[PDB]
Each structure stands twice: as C-alpha cells, then as structure tokens.
Design a binder for this molecule. Sequence first.
Ligand SMILES: *[C@](O)(OCC/C(C)=C\C(=O)N(C)O)[C@H](CCCN(O)C(=O)CC)NC(C)=O
Ligand SMILES: [Fe+3]
Ligand SMILES: [Fe+3]
Lengths: 279, 282
Amino acid sequence: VPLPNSEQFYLENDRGEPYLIQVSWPLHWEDKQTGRGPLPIIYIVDGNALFLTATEAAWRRAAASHFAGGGIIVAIGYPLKGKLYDARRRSFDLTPPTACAPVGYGGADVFLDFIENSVRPAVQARFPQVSLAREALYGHSYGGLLALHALFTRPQSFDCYIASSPSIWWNSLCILHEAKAFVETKKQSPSLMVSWGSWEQHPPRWADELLDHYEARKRTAAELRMADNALDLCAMLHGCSRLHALIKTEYEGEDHTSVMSCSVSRGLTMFFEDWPFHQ
Amino acid sequence: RPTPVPLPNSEQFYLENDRGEPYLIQVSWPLHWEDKQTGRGPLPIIYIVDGNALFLTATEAAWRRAAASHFAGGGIIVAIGYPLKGKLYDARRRSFDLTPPTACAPVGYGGADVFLDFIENSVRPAVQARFPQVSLAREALYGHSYGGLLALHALFTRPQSFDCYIASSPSIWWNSLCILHEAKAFVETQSPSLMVSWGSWEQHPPRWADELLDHYEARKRTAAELRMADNALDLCAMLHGCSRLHALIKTEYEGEDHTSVMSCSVSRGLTMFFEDWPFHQS
Ligand SMILES: *[C@](O)(OCC/C(C)=C\C(=O)N(C)O)[C@H](CCCN(O)C(=O)CC)NC(C)=O
Ligand SMILES: [Fe+3]
Ligand SMILES: [Fe+3]
C-alpha cells in the first residue's frame, strides 16, 4: 500500500545527475487541487532519510490547535536501495567550495542552484493553484552546513534556514569565515533555526561498552565539538542586521542520529504555524 | 511522470478483536533486508498504539539507526491503528481502547483490558507468524496521551506482559487521576522498565504571534488543569525505589508541545529499547 497524499519523480541537474524528489501535502486534502492560495513549503536535503518523518509530523499537526492549514513537504534525495544516504553524492552536494577540500567536495552552490532553478519550479508546476507563501531549507549534518552556507552566501533565496546539528567542524571551521562576512556586511531579513542533541558532544557510556571504546567516542565528540561550535556561531550572529530571528534548541538525551526526528518535526512545525518569529 | 511513494520493507494487515472491532496492523523491518524472511534469530519488537499517527516516524527512525555506530541489527516495528482515511486518529475507538475501567467513566470509555488482551492474544501471534525464523527477544509497549495512560495501566496491572513500557505525555489527569490508585497498589505489593516523557510547552505553553490574551489565558487554564509535567514527575517520584521496577527513565523535551513531542519520544523509545538494553539501574 503506497503513502496517501504524496508522490515522487526524478529530476536531473544541469550535469545530468539524477535526484529523487518526494512531495507530500496535507492529509485532509482529497486531491492536490484541494489547496488554494498561499502555502508554506520546506525543502529537505538527504531526502530519503527524512521524507516519511517530516510527512507524518506535518500530518500530525492537523490534530493540534495551532494548525493553520499545513504546507508542502519536499524531500530532495537520491536513487537508493536498502539505505538512506549516498555518501559520495551528498559529500559534494552539501559542502561549500574551499581550496584545500579533497576531491568530491565543494558542490554546494551547484546543488543550491539545482534546488532554486529545477526543484522549486517543478514542485510549483505540480500545484498550479497555490502560491509559495514562504520557503524553508532544512538540512542535517553536512545538510546543516549547507543550510548555514545558503544563509551566509544567498540569504534572499529562502525565508527560513534550519540547521540541524550542523557540521561546523568540517574543513577547519570554514563556515565561520562566511559567518563573519555575513555579519560584517551592512544591509526583509531571513530567520535561522539551529539545534543539536545533548549526547553529541557529551555522550554517556553504553550498557555493553568498555572504557577504551568510550574514551575514543568522547575524544571524537570533543574534536567535532557540536554544541560549543553551534553556540559560538549563534553568539556570533547575535544582534545581526541581516537576520530577523535566531532560534537555538538543545534536545535532551538525543544523539546525532536520533535528534533528526526531533529537529525536522519541530522545524516544519515552527515554520508552518509560528511565522513570523519574534526577534 | 510522478508515481505514488512506495514504503519498502513493510506490510499492513487487518485484525479483529474478540468483540469483532477492526484494527489496522502496520509492520516494518530493517531496510537493509532483501526480504521479510531475511532476518533470523532474536530481535526486539515495539508495539505502538495510535498506530496510524506514529508508524512512518517509528519506521524511518529505526531505519536511520542503521547509519549510527550502536546499530545491532535493528528490530521490528508494530503499529496498532484503525481503518482511517484523511486523518491519523479515531477519537471514538481510542477513547475506549486506551482508558482503564472505572465506575464513574462515561459511555465509550474503560476498554483498556480488552485492548491489551487483543495485543497479547491476537497481534503478537499474528506478527510471530509473519516472522517464523525470528524469536521475540524482548517486547516494548509505546503510547502517547491516552496511549501513555494505557502503557502505565499495563505496567501496574499486567507488569510481566511486556519488558518495557514507554509512556509519552501520559494523560494522568483523566478521570480525577484514577491511575494513581493502580500506581499505589503496584508499589505496595526480572522486573520491567519504564520510560516517561513530556514536552516543556505542554503545562507551560508560550503565547502565539497575534494571539489575544483571552485566548492565551484559556490555553493556560487547560494546561494548568491537565498538569502534564507535574503529574508525570509526581508519578515518577512515587515509583522511584520500587521493588517491581528495574529502571525508570524520565525526559523533558525543550520547546515541544503535546503533538510535536511525539516525534522525539517514539524515536528515543525505540532507539534505547533496540540498542541500549538492558538499561542502567535508575
Ligand atoms: C554528517 O553528514 O553526519 C551524517 C552522516 C550520515 C547521514 C551517514 C554516514 O555517515 N554514513 C552512511 O556512513 C557528518 C558526516 C561526516 C563524514 N563522516 O561520515 C565521518 O565519519 C567523519 C569523521 N557527521 C557529523 C558527525 O557531523
Ligand atoms: Fe562516517
Ligand atoms: Fe481532543
């Protein structure tokens, strides 16, 4: 039995690389044509890994009291079989260009161009009767790095950026350069949502785990520095002229993988129902 | 030419209870399996009530664990829902199925024992039949709101029925805190584990944008009466140092409401039960 009120299709970028675009719309709709007028839309990178959660989370909002009509979910993924991630494809698509970056990295701007010039029009054609009230870009890990990169380099492209556990550590904190250029530049501003799990930088010991293995995980966690890097960036963006609102959340007892469920669920909830955010 | 979205490594089937009331059972298994009959040996299983609302989240969250370091083959998801179209809840059915029996309960309530019997005597065998080569290593019961009230009711009245009980934002308020009677009886008389959770904005909701004060005060009135966080903490406090409880985990999710927290609790629930068993003696 297929998912209700959803569809998927393949788009190729300008270089002939395929993408699986998965789309869902409010469950109470009979057809796609049911929806009229302005609706919010969210674009989710690593689409395969999060489409179903974001879809069901959006449907669950129908029962909530602050439901305003819902919005369109767009998951941008890859053709996969028996797994949720394409390590090779995402490594290029989600990381910004740098001089010292190894091969198969630094294709963020190519991928963002694809989203704006291919995915957005394609989805808009599937809903001719509706207009895009506002657009959100969600990503987790390298996806979050892409979200931050998109904000700092093309802030007008999207209304809201949602960086779930962003890989700020990547490439000797290259994103902090762009963050500095963003704040130092002086000039409606978009919003930013940052989040991370509490067990990312400070993980507890597993039931089966021994000391050496645990110490190795702690050393890794310390190097990646998920929470502190995010706070450093958030403190850096505090009182910025080019940013309307900045929301930051720490999810208690959540690891890098588990927090994805929380961040994507709240991300679209806030964006759909609680727009605009207070300063 | 767009197509419908297929859900891989999953199937659904309908079951009747003894009373002849229909249920939609939705099952999923690890994504890396070629077939349903790929897996063998002991695997953990989680039963999720209000199945329609939580199946896809639990399914995909379980699949996401494959990428994590602490993956141990995964487990089986079982969502116990209803035949529905255009919504994720059946208010009438769930009102009966998820609430315990009391003398002062209105019409259409107090059918928890009927539903729990259905889970043990119908759902469990039906799932076991579909996975012959799999043995049920351990069983968890998850529920949210009334579902959490059912999970607590199940723990206090039939503790040996499941190994782990996960109560997400349990409706302890229901029927003048009638669950506290069962809770008191339980403590006063190995052991199963309990996972309790709630959202921070449930009992203390912030004001929405362009919300009239009158409307906001009405929401605060409800929040105060339902007393989600305090009731849960009060119940947890009572159960602490109980002989018939191995471990008790309690979490509060920052900036989460009654609906949104469901995503977190179900994800946390299956994660810990699948990967971090057995729990520390807390
Ligand atoms: C971020 O992208 O984490 C997500 C990793 C995912 C979704 C899948 C995966 O890792 N698979 C299938 O192997 C980054 C990724 C960093 C690159 N990496 O895989 C490393 O191992 C790096 C030491 N990770 C974080 C923690 O931000
Ligand atoms: Fe890796
Ligand atoms: Fe209600």
